[PDB]
Design an enzyme around this catalytic site. Sequence first.
Site, PDB file in Angstrom:
ATOM      1  N   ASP A 123       0.712  -1.182   0.095  1.00  0.00           N
ATOM      2  CA  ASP A 123       0.092   0.132  -0.163  1.00  0.00           C
ATOM      3  C   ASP A 123       0.827   1.367   0.029  1.00  0.00           C
ATOM      4  O   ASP A 123       0.591   2.161   0.911  1.00  0.00           O
ATOM      5  CB  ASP A 123      -0.853  -0.239   1.125  1.00  0.00           C
ATOM      6  CG  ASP A 123      -1.811  -1.366   1.365  1.00  0.00           C
ATOM      7  OD1 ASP A 123      -2.176  -1.997   0.100  1.00  0.00           O
ATOM      8  OD2 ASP A 123      -1.955  -1.764   2.613  1.00  0.00           O
ATOM      9  N   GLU A 126     -11.433   0.763  -3.751  1.00  0.00           N
ATOM     10  CA  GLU A 126     -10.775   1.026  -2.611  1.00  0.00           C
ATOM     11  C   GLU A 126      -9.387   1.983  -2.733  1.00  0.00           C
ATOM     12  O   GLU A 126      -9.553   2.408  -4.142  1.00  0.00           O
ATOM     13  CB  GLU A 126     -10.628  -0.177  -1.590  1.00  0.00           C
ATOM     14  CG  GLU A 126      -9.316  -1.080  -2.228  1.00  0.00           C
ATOM     15  CD  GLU A 126      -8.811  -2.237  -1.231  1.00  0.00           C
ATOM     16  OE1 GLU A 126      -9.054  -3.215  -1.633  1.00  0.00           O
ATOM     17  OE2 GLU A 126      -8.456  -1.717  -0.037  1.00  0.00           O
TER      18      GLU A 126
END
Lengths: 533, 535
Positions: free
Chosen positions: B14, B186
């Site tokens: 991420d 997302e």
Amino acid sequence: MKITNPVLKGFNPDPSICRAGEDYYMAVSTFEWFPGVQIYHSKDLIHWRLAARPLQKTSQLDMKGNPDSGGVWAPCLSYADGQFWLIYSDIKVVDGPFKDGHNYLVTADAVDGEWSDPVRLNSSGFDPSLFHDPSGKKYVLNMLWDHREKHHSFAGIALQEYSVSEKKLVGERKVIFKGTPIKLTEAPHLYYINDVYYLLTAEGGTRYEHAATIARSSRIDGPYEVHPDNPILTAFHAPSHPLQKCGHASIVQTHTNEWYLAHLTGRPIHSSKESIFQQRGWCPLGRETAIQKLEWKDGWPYVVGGKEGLLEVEAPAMSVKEFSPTYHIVDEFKDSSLNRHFQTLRIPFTDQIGSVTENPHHLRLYGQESLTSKFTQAFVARRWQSFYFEAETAVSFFPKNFQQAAGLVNYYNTENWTALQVTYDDALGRILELSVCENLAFSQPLIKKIIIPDEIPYVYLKVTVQRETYTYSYSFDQQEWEKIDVPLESTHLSDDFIRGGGFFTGAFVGMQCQDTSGERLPADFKYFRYEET
Amino acid sequence: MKITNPVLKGFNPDPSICRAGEDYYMAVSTFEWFPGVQIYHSKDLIHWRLAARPLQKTSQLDMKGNPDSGGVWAPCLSYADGQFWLIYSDIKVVDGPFKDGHNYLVTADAVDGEWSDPVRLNSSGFDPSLFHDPSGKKYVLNMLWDHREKHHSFAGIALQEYSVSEKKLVGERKVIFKGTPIKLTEAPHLYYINDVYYLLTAEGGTRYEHAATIARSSRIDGPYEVHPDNPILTAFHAPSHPLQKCGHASIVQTHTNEWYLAHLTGRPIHSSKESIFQQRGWCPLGRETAIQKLEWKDGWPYVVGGKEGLLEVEAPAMSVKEFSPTYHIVDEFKDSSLNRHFQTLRIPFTDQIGSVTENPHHLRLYGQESLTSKFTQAFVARRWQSFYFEAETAVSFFPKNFQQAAGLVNYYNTENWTALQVTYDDALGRILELSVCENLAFSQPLIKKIIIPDEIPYVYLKVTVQRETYTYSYSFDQQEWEKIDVPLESTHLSDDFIRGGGFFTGAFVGMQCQDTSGERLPADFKYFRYEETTE
């Protein structure tokens, strides 16, 4: 008058009975429910009042994150040297090869007084017990947990002296007893009776092979010889007996010179399409507490009536004393504290989750995490304690998004519950929604979604429990009720249904608010009715 | 010189990339590992140094009991108004209908400075992100998690203004984007470029359907128009590509007016007996960070070289700045602070579990809970960051009962690990024992136990990691090494093997001591060698 079993109904396992004068006390386990340990009081062994919950502070008991059926396993309550002694556990791992958990000691002058902060004892296995040897020396017993692949996990009963002055276990621990072929040897309790040491243990596990074993020795460290007709208590061989899982016992000699045996037991609901010999049943009331009478022969005790246990037991020679009720049938939240039959999951009741003062005569719950969270739930609940009852509440709740919901919940663990909640639907406004969680399989079965008009200040919510089945109903004025025609299975909220390594509590009913948006939106509950029918 | 991918090897998912002047930073997620969030720094986008781990106090991050792969999910690091802003999450529930977790904001003048105590933002979904609008207003984006039975759980991207002065979100949230058919939308990040709002998202989940999609709008709250060749990044269609799971990206425009895309990726090990199209592989190094170059056409960015990503990427026009190592190959524990590549599970490193000063030049670990516990483990570990390496330690440990064990551990989560430990057996005395936990199935496969003589002060322990397999060995002298004839599978310590709802970290190797009797028996580790041997 007889003792009528169970004497503690609903979730009340692992009874540890003791005597102080003409007063009798039993401590039972509470697992993840807070505050920890329940202590009941009696003057006749027939009638028991809920007297205290000792573990009220996170300094004593910090269970945030604990697994379902972790936390406070079997406790040991004793009275000696003018004070009560409570030995308890905080179990952190309940599945797999390990059983990580820690054993502690606290004291108090009275069971409902302020308890000390804990002394660390050991971590070597659960069911710790404090024995007050006639010499004045103290000893801690517990089972030893063996994680190793090639060994049975119940490696026997450990004994080690506890030093009151050093506030620690001293010397070296000794394994004094390895059990019988029933195995799963645990729940050790030592008694000194007519200059003989008696070691009581549980064996067979706390499902339907449960038993109470007893052995005896002239020396505290053995060797111990097992009772010739062991086990002294079990219903393993008797699947139709109304008391099942009979084990984890403790013994009391009364001030009337009579002998009694407290133990846990389950009362199962059976399936008519199964054999009770193969499917022994489901217990939504969990493990309850029963009392048996003992008789002695040739220095061995025997359960009066046979080892299965009786529903009606000969009471001791004492004046009967019934107690005042300890909960309101209709609780209107007039008190500055939550009634003692309410518990929260894992954490203390603080304004993190709720308040009884912010909106007088209501329980206000600030919406927090869902019913699946082992951390911070705004959920206040009490035990199912009968197969037939109604429970009812009325909630003021005006949610503004679908992540806000509040209402009435029946609950076993984070994976197993049903909930009837006021929530919000973007197209239809406030709606009343049924949610079902069965071993973490989630469903909302209503196709016909129930629209709640803006002008309704309180939504009245009810559950009617009828042994194997329970159903919800709702009202907008507490007069015309509408049944939610989804029959729900009580056996799905039972020790015997839920998955995982910990299956040790029982069904609860309660009031709940969640807000997974972040707004902490409050729900105000005007009352909570619990009425056994 | 080119950028060689992955630029952050081993467990580094991420990536949130940002610029401060001519300095470049990337924040990555850390899940249950403590301290939380890792920030890396670069002057050229080629070379990266581990610079800071901001979440150091229980007041910022309290993860005791957190599920495996809960805790710190994707973070968002940004620089504006003279300070750094870090948005992070603490996820409490990772399986089932809900995803209970909370989002927070902290600030600092420097990434390795003292970070503030957290401001509460919301709890409505993970991947929170802070956007600095040209109006000077601030906005928080996050995905919206929908638990309801009949809805897809990824209900779109929420947007809500954050008030700096009031320290809270204000107004009402808006759903500004619903995603594409790839779904699982997302990782929202907003960029304002040439008077257009660009919203970047991840879609398809973080396994082999992962993608980065991008959409644009002239208004911050949409409606957004999707890229005509969407997604701009994905290897879903290319099972043989060396970079997989390519998604959860962030964009930086350099001070040299060039455009780059950081993203996570997995480098899988495959099985020769399966089709790569059906069994896409196992990643023991978890999710790593890579950087691609972007080029623009008609107001849309494109990944240079194709949507799949390249292993060697055109670097920006900057002077090369290499960094020297931030760990010692052989750490002899002479320093009184643990090296920055070591982490602990969930809780800070305190006297509860160990000390590097009590016995100087040793790491002392006080025996606590087992490797299956989500609470208090005396376990100090570092990432696998190469498919080929050796790790080695030497332990002084004198257990007196079978509930005490200390040694060398390779670890994914509480249900998945192996351990080579000095322990005690009532029939043999001190033994060296191998324990194996595979999705909580426990085995100790050595039939003949390894006896340790009383006179041995240190037991030397080694793991040799060889891509798909690894083996342990041991020595009592540090000169003659004895084999342990149990082949172990590196793929069993991978995101793609372990069961359950959270599968988001990667393999670690470390030093450990447990004492489940209660005595807190200490083990002293004399050194920790970690020696990569790739090339």
